[PDB]
């Protein structure tokens, strides 16, 4: 099938809010084996973010109920968990087989390594006590590798660099229960960007400053 026709259908599926169709299109594009363009990379990410995000949101709701008949909720939670782990493993496989090894530019390597850190983080949120350490380790090493490259290659105001900080700081706070590391990473990222506002670009200055607002909002939550 021609790649450009699948990307056009992914953009119509996104407008229609049909994210499982969007994901199927972008996965078929990725599986052709050619490095994605930035636009294709962003479409594959939005599709999967929304697929997995629906299950994360239902999992949180059914967990809350189950904790507050209990058995029925446990099994429903387990069913949602199974779907969520399958979606994460889908993305993690694409990442390993196509996206990370094809990434020929630093910005895309940081984007993908950040994605691998996020999808391991979602698996960690639902992990068997026994598998949890390994999964947490894999999320942290993906984010650590993305972090070192972003620090080397990107300006402190670059939105991918700022989004990595935001998500890796939330990994520290929610998954490793390390709030001082979380706050320090978020504060440094915010401060290093304020120190270089002349680097903001007319293409991305609202994206950069929005993520900085989010870093400070989490700092506010965490210091309050």
């Amino acid at each position: 099938m021609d790649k450009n026709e699948l990307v056009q259908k992914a953009k119509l599926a996104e407008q229609a809010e049909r994210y499982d169709d969007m994901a199927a299109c972008m996965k078929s594009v990725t599986e052709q084996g050619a490095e994605l363009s930035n636009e294709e990379r962003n479409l594959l990410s939005v599709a999967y973010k929304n697929v997995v995000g629906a299950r994360r949101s239902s999992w949180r709701v059914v967990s809350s109920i189950e904790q507050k008949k209990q058995q029925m909720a446990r099994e429903y939670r387990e069913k949602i968990e199974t779907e969520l782990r399958d979606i994460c493993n889908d993305v993690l496989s694409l990442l390993e087989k196509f996206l990370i090894p094809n990434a020929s530019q630093a910005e895309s390597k940081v984007f993908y390594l950040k994605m691998k850190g996020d999808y391991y983080r979602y698996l960690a949120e639902v992990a068997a006590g026994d598998d949890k350490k390994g999964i947490v380790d894999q999320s942290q090493q993906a984010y650590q590798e993305a972090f070192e490259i972003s620090k080397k290659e990107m300006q402190p105001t670059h939105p991918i660099r700022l989004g990595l900080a935001l998500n890796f700081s939330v990994f520290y706070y929610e998954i490793l229960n390390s709030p001082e590391k979380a706050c320090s990473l978020a504060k440094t990222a915010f401060d290093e960007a304020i120190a270089e506002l002349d680097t903001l670009s007319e293409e991305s200055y609202k994206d950069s400053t929005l993520i900085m607002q989010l870093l400070r909002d989490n700092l506010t939550l965490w210091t309050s």
Binding site: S45, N167, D207
Partner: peptide
């Protein structure tokens, strides 16, 4: 000042 789809694609946490 927004890159097309980029903030949404970055699956921002929080």
């Amino acid at each position: 000042g927004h890159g097309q789809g980029l903030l949404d694609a970055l699956d921002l946490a929080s």
